[PDB]
Amino acid sequence: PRVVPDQRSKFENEEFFRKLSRECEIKYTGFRDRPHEERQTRFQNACRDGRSEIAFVATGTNLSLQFFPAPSREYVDLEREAGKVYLKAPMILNGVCVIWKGWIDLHRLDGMGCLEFDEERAQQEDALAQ
Amino acid sequence: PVIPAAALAGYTGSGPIQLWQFLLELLTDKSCQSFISWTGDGWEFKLSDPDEVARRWGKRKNKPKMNYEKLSRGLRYYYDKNIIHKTAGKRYVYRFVCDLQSLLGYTPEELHAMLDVK
Amino acid sequence: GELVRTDSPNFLCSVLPTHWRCNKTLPIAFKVVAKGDVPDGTLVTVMAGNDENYSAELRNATAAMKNQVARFNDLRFVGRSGRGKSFTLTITVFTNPPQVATYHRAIAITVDGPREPR
DNA sequence: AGAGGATGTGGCTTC
DNA sequence: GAAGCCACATCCTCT
């Protein structure tokens, strides 16, 4: 069971996904025990590698992010703002294909983000499983 | 028994006195210069009679079975909290690395003088 | 041993104590089992947090899949979950694309953990 | 002599 | 009062 049957609906319902469907505050959960500088150079460089660790401060739900389609360019943008970094990364969270999208201050190391169904991956996946 | 090191460190009575505070209290008492004393360098000190320092600590904490072997593990716990470090290579010589000046209000030279360290 | 469903239809995991001491080795090695087919060598990683701690400090939170099993060697929780509050595990299996499975109210971590009424 | 892991214990505070 | 957080007190293994 790589995914759940009611893939479409399980996202529409269930408090889990719901509570994480708006511009919820998010933060970089990495090397918290290290000087702010380090967490900065680390967090950014790591983004240039297409990966990062982030969680929704509010709900406290952590997540490992990988910025690639199911060396990146549009999945990790640093042009849409003079200091911010807009990211994006798909995944199969709890049997539901979704896409994480949000931004983060290249200094304060935090920002906003959320989840949104991935009709494509969900559909394709529903296939492989039938 | 010059300045009230215990107090200047934060101790107020509430809860046990902490090992570093108790040591400091012994370092500011001219009578204890036999077993514990300043090396005359910054806030570095030496326990000349560890077993003695341990007894008084044991006594002050009410743990009769205490001993240096144990007291030292206490000190070692400070390495990470940056209160007291170990003077490498010098037996029984440690050093306060927190800001004793700000707490005591005196400086190392000042205190060493007041305590008449030789 | 005994497994448990997670918030994902594709993964299972071992059972964790309800309350435990921080930085304290676990009573049962934590493992992640994959129902589906997952290529050996695949990396697996756990994280934790709650509405009191967005990201719990962990230790050895990484393991590689082997025969559908990712056996975590001495996983430890260092961040505290808060009085009453617990942690929400976020198991992550790195495949293409990565598969993440949560597990709410999984473990409660405190400084002392399970203690006999004083 | 000295570093540091593992775990239990009593003081005080907060829920 | 239980449940938390702290600072050790005890024990031990390794170098």
Question: For residue B27, what is the domain's CATH number?
Answer: 1.10.10.10
Q: How far is C77 from chain A (nearest CA, A)?
A: 14
Nearest chain C Cα to A125, which residue?
C97
What single DSSP character describes residue C49? -
Q: Given the structure tokens 């695949």, which residue do they identify?
A: C42
How far is residue C35's CA from residue A19's CA, in Å, rounded to a whole number? 28
- CA dist A95 and A104 (Å) reads 27
Find, in chain C, the residue whose alpha carbon is nearest to that of A56.
C54
- The structure was resolved experimentally with X-ray
Q: How far is the CA of C40 from the C1' of E3 (A)?
A: 43
B87, C8, B107: which is closest to A3 by C-alpha? C8
Element (H, E) at C96: none
> What DSSP designation does B31 have?
G
Q: What is the domain range of residue C76?
A: 1-118
Rounded to an integer, what distance in angstroms lies between the CA atom of residue A115 and that of residue A90?
A: 9
Q: Helix or strand or coil: residue B86?
A: strand
Using an 8 Å Cβ cutoff, are B61 and B74 in contact?
A: no
The total number of structural domains in chain A stands at 1
**Residue closest to A91 by CA, chosen among A115, A60, A127:** A115
Give every CB contact of residue C36 below 8 A, 6+ residues apart in sequence: A1, A2, C10
Residue identified by tokens 């203690």 is: C115
Specify the nucleotide whose C1' lies closest to residue B91 (CA): D1
Handedness of CA B86, B90, B91, B92 (dihedral sign): negative
Give the span between the Cα atoms of B115 and B38, in whole angstroms: 9
* Pairing status of strand C69-71 against strand C31-34: antiparallel
| Interatomic separation, CA of residue C115 and C1' of nucleotide E11, rounded (Å) | 20
Question: Which uninterrupted H or E stretch holds A11?
Answer: helix A7-12
Going by C-alpha positions, the residue among A2, A9, A35, A20 that lies closest to residue A99 is A20
- Domain containing residue C22: CATH number: 2.60.40.720
CATH number, domain of A78, equals 2.40.250.10
Cα–Cα distance for residue pair B76/C21, rounded to 1 Å: 22
Which residues constitute the domain of residue A98? 1-130
- What distance in Å separates the CA atoms of residue B47 and residue B26, rounded to the nearest whole number? 11
Tell me whether strands C19-21 and C99-110 are parallel, antiparallel or unpaired: parallel
Q: How many domains does chain C have?
A: 1
Phi, psi dihedrals of residue C30, rounded to the nearest 5°: -80, 130
Q: Is B66 left (phi over 0), alpha (psi -120 to 50) or beta?
A: beta
Contacts of B109 (CB under 8 A, 6+ apart): none
Look up residue A115 and give its amino acid: L
DSSP SS3 for A125: helix
- Contact yes or no for C108/C86 (Cβ under 8 A): yes
Identify the residues numbered 80 to 99 in chain B whose C-beta atom is closer than 7 Å to any atom of strand E: 81
Say if residues A87 and A20 touch (Cβ distance below 8 Å).
no
Q: Is the dihedral of CA C34, C39, C45, C51 positive or negative?
A: negative
DSSP A111: E
A95 and C10 within 8 Å at the Cβ level: the answer is yes
Distance CA C118, CA C109 (A): 20
Quote the CA–CA distance of C104 and C90 in Å, as a whole number: 9
Backbone angles phi, psi at C49, to 5 degrees: 180, 175
A34 touches chain C (CB under 8 A): no
Q: Helices (H), strands (E): how many in chain C? A: 0, 11
Asked if residues B19 and B57 have their Cβ atoms less than 8 Å apart, the reply is yes
Resolution of the coordinates in A? 2.9
A74, A6, A63: which is closest to A29 by C-alpha?
Answer: A63
Which residues in chain A are closer than 8 Å to C90, comparing Cβ atoms?
55, 61-64
Structure tokens given for A82: 């003079």
Chains that touch C (3 or more CB pairs under 8 A): A
Following DSSP, what letter does each residue of A43-108 receive, concatenated? Answer: HHHHHHTTEEEEEETTTTEEEEEE-S----SSSEESSSSSSEEEEEEEEEETTEEEEEEEEEETTT
Total tally of structural domains belonging to chain B: 1
C-alpha distances in Å from residue A127, one per residue of A2, A5, A89, A117, C15: 11, 11, 21, 16, 33
Distance CA A54, CA A49 (A): 15
8 A C-beta contact, residue A65 and residue A53:
yes
Domain span at residue B23 reads: 1-118
Q: Which residues of C22-57 are buried (b: 16+ CB within 10 A; e: fewer)?
A: beeebeeebbbbbebebeeebebbbbbbbebbbbbb
Q: A31: helix, coil or strand?
A: coil
Give the strands of the sheet with B44-47, arranged side by side: B36-41, B44-47, B93-96, B84-86
**Measured distance between the N- and C-terminal CA atoms of chain A, rounded to whole angstroms:** 11
| CB-CB under 8 Å, C48 with A62 | yes
**Of residues C100, C89, C82, C109, the one with CA closest to residue C17:** C109
Q: Which nucleotides of E are covered by protein (CB under 7 A)?
A: 2-12
Paired tokens of B12: 């107020």
| Torsion, CA A93, CA A98, CA A104, CA A106, rounded to 10 | 80
Structural tokens at position C87: 């942690």
Q: Which amino acid is at C68?
A: Q
DSSP state, residue B38 = E
Where helices occur in chain B by DSSP H, the ranges are 5-8, 19-27, 50-61, 68-81, 100-104, 108-115
* Whole-angstrom distance, CA of residue A96 vs CA of residue A123: 10
The DSSP secondary-structure symbol of B42 reads T
The footprint of strand D (CB < 7 Å) covers B 14-16, 72-73, 76, 79, 86, 88, 90-93; C 23-25, 83-84, 112, 115-116, 118
- A129 near C CB under 8 A: no
* Bridge partners for C66 per DSSP: C69
